[PDB]
Each structure stands twice: as C-alpha cells, then as structure tokens.
Amino acid sequence: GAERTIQLPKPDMNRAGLLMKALSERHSTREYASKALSNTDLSDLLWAANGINRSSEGKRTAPSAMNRQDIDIYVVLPQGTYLYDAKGHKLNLISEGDHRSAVAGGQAFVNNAPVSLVLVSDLSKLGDAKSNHVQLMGAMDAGIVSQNISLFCSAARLATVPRASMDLVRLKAALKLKDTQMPMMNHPVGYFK
Amino acid sequence: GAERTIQLPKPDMNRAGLLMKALSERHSTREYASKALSNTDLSDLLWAANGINRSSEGKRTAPSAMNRQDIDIYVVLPQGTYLYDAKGHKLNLISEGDHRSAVAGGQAFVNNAPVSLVLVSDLSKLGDAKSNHVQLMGAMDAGIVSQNISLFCSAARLATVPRASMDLVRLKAALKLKDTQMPMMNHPVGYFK
Numbered sequence: 001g002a003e004r005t006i007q008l009p010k011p012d013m014n015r016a017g018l019l020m021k022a023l024s025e026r027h028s029t030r031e032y033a034s035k036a037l038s039n040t041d042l043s044d045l046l047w048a049a050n051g052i053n054r055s056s057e058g059k060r061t062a063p064s065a066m067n068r069q070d071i072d073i074y075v076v077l078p079q080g081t082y083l084y085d086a087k088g089h090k091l092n093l094i095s096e097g098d099h100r101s102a103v104a105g106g107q108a109f110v111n112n113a114p115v116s117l118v119l120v121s122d123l124s125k126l127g128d129a130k131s132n133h134v135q136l137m138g139a140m141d142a143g144i145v146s147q148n149i150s151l152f153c154s155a156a157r158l159a160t161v162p163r164a165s166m167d168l169v170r171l172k173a174a175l176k177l178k179d180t181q182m183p184m185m186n187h188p189v190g191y192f193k
Numbered sequence: 194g195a196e197r198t199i200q201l202p203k204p205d206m207n208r209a210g211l212l213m214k215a216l217s218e219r220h221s222t223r224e225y226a227s228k229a230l231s232n233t234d235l236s237d238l239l240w241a242a243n244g245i246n247r248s249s250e251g252k253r254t255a256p257s258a259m260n261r262q263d264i265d266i267y268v269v270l271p272q273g274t275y276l277y278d279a280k281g282h283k284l285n286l287i288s289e290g291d292h293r294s295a296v297a298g299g300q301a302f303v304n305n306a307p308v309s310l311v312l313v314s315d316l317s318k319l320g321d322a323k324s325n326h327v328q329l330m331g332a333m334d335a336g337i338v339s340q341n342i343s344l345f346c347s348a349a350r351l352a353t354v355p356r357a358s359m360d361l362v363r364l365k366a367a368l369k370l371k372d373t374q375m376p377m378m379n380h381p382v383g384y385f386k
C-alpha cells in the first residue's frame with residue numbers, strides 16, 4: 001500500500017525563474033498533462049507554498065497572522081492523501097486511496113490533475129474557530145499561500161488554478177479533519193498538456 | 194496642492210529578481226529608510242500587486258473569485274491618498290493630505306514608511322456585502338494581492354510587513370470608502386534602513 005512517509009528531496013531554493021516573468025505569466029489553467037509531477041517539482045512547489053525559509057526562527061515563505069502558521073497543506077495524490085511537514089521536507093500519510101474527487105466537488109476537470117494541494121486553516125491556532133473575525137484571518141492566510149503556489153507554478157511552467165469549491169463532507173472525511181480545521185482553497189497542479 | 198493624477202512609468206515586467214530567492218528572503222520588516230520610493234519602484238510594485246498581465250482579456254497578476262477583481266489598492270503618500278488604476282498605470286487622487294496615521298492605527302512604526310498600500314475589497318463585486326461567505330472570499334483575494342506585494346518587495350529589496358490592523362473609522366473617512374468596501378490588509382513599504 002501507500003508509503004507512510006514520502007521523503008522529498010531538499011528544495012532547490014535557487015531554481016531558475018524570474019519573479020516578474022512569473023507575474024506576467026500567472027494565470028488559471030483547468031487542463032493538465034496526465035504524468036505525475038517529479039519529486040523535485042513537488043518538493044520545490046511545497047517549499048514555495050509554505051516552507052521554512054529561516055531555519056533558526058522556524059519562519060516561513062508565507063506570512064501568517066501573529067506568526068501562528070495556521071495553514072496546513074494536504075497533498076492529494078492518486079495513491080493517498082498526505083500532510084506536508086515543512087520541518088522535514090516530507091509528506092506523512094493521512095488516508096490511503098485516491099481522494100481527488102473530494103477536492104473536485106462539482107468540477108470534474110480537477111480529477112485530471114495528478115496532484116491537488118488543499119489549504120486548510122487550523123482555526124484554533126488563531127483563536128475561536130467559530131469567530132467570523134478568526135475565519136477572515138485564516139482566509140487571508142490561505143490566499144497568501146495560494147499565491148505562492150500560483151507564482152511558483154508560473155515560474156516552473158506548471159498548470160494550476162486557485163479554487164474555493166470542493167465537496168466538504170467527503171473532504172473532511174478523506175483528510176480526517178477536526179471540526180476546528182477549515183478547508184479554504186485548493187490547487188490542482190500538473191504539467192501543461 | 195496634490196496632483197489629481199500621478200502618471201507612473203510603464204512597469205518593467207522583466208525586472209531582475211529570482212522568485213526562489215524572493216521566497217527565501219521573504220520576511221516582515223517594521224523599520225524603513227525615510228526616502229520616498231522612486232516612481233519606477235512604486236510602478237513596478239503596484240503592477241506586481243494587481244496589475245493587468247493580459248491586456249486583451251483585462252486579467253490580472255492576482256487571481257480573484259470569479260474574476261470579479263474585487264481588490265482595490267489605495268496608495269497612502271505624505272501628500273495625499275490615491276487609488277491605483279491598473280488600466281492606465283496611474284494613481285487618481287482621493288483625498289489630500291497625509292493619512293498614514295489612519296493606516297497605522299495603534300502601531301506608530303507605520304508612519305515611518307514613505308508609502309502604505311491599503312487593500313480594500315469591494316464586496317459588492319462579489320455578492321452580498323453582509324454575507325460572511327462573501328467576506329471570506331474578499332479576504333482570500335486580499336491575501337493573494339498581499340503576497341504579490343511581499344514577494345515583489347523581497348525581490349526588489351524593499352521593506353514591508355502585511356498587516357490587518359488599522360484605524361477603520363479614520364481610514365474609511367480618509368479613503369472615502371462606501372459601506373460595501375471593506376479594508377482587509379495594508380502594507381507599509383520602504384527601502385531598508
């Protein structure tokens with residue numbers, strides 16, 4: 001069955017790709033090559049999204065409210081759903097099997113991407129999970145991470161689209177989410193077709 | 194008095210600066226050189242934040258929910274507060290005088306930055322402004338724009354910090370905001386001291 005930990009290679013924090021060109025070419029794509037992302041590309045993508053960029057401080061590529069670091073990245077692959085661990089550049093298995101449909105919700109195109117990243121805010125890290133103000137903070141934090149992903153994909157020539165739509169009942173189950181974890185956004189990612 | 198329109202130079206969409214290095218060096222800074230940003234730097238910053246990257250389609254560097262393009266960027270300078278117009282790469286005067294304190298709220302350090310960008314979601318472009326779900330969309334959209342700014346600043350060697358705090362009463366007045374416009378975030382920006 002699925003590996004309980006996928007060890008990804010060290011991210012290449014010096015990878016080619018101009019920011020300004022990444023901004024110019026930043027766009028949503030809803031069609032994907034079928035092939036899996038290389039582990040190099042998946043590693044670099046995850047570090048860009050919300051990796052540790054200052055080791056001694058444990059701080060991240062993505063800012064967060066009060067440095068609470070509330071956004072977790074779940075990685076939904078055909079063989080299983082994993083949770084990104086930035087401290088080890090590794091993925092820890094959450095649930096076996098293919099849960100892309102849960103990410104897709106009503107949009108079938110999403111199942112065509114070889115991987116989806118799901119941005120889930122752990123609202124308890126921010127305050128009262130039932131507070132609208134706390135939710136708005138988590139939402140802001142998710143958008144921050146989303147644009148790291150979109151820009152990385154543009155620089156790296158990967159297809160992606162930021163999405164808010166998903167089947168929350170099936171996704172809660174698939175990602176084994178607590179009631180205080182709120183899925184905010186997701187990103188199907190693949191090579192261009 | 195203040196120019197009613199500041200015409201900024203065409204943004205240099207091919208400006209030096211690796212994305213991966215921008216990610217590595219991305220961090221919050223709460224101290225600033227006193228000198229004003231060059232108009233070149235302010236132009237490039239605003240285009241990165243939420244410029245038009247596909248002219249024929251009118252689409253932007255920052256994605257938005259349904260392409261509703263809800264995030265407006267107000268630019269708070271010593272001489273006046275302006276609204277960024279992406280279609281003309283220009284700034285249109287909203288209110289004369291220095292309104293940095295309104296952005297600062299309880300944090301006096303903010304008045305030390307020569308410019309602050311205020312990210313205001315026009316919630317009516319998204320739906321019912323009173324809906325929590327609509328607000329969460331606007332918040333996500335603001336975070337997207339925020340991280341464009343943070344990454345640009347890292348690439349360009351500008352100091353910035355994403356903030357949610359501000360004096361909303363004084364800011365509403367200063368930016369002449371409608372009830373359906375919700376300030377979400379702000380970014381003091383300057384050169385490093």
Ligand SMILES: Cc1cc2nc3c(=O)[nH]c(=O)nc-3n(C[C@H](O)[C@H](O)[C@H](O)COP(=O)(O)O)c2cc1C
Pocket residue numbers: 059060062063064065066067068137140141144219220221222223300354355356357358
């Ligand atoms: C949504 C959001 C709201 C924030 N609000 C404030 C704020 O009001 N004032 C401030 O000084 N910093 C604010 N911060 C900056 C965080 O404190 C900062 O991101 C955090 O300490 C991590 O530091 P880093 O950005 O260097 O990684 C905010 C950050 C985010 C993402």
Ligand SMILES: Cc1cc2nc3c(=O)[nH]c(=O)nc-3n(C[C@H](O)[C@H](O)[C@H](O)COP(=O)(O)O)c2cc1C
Pocket residue numbers: 026027028029030107161162163164165252253255256257258259260261330333334337
């Ligand atoms: C917060 C947010 C939510 C979105 N939700 C969806 C979605 O559920 N499904 C989808 O196909 N696109 C979604 N989009 C993508 C937008 O439709 C897209 O950004 C917009 O059409 C502009 O296109 P562009 O990204 O190429 O600039 C979302 C975008 C954002 C920022």
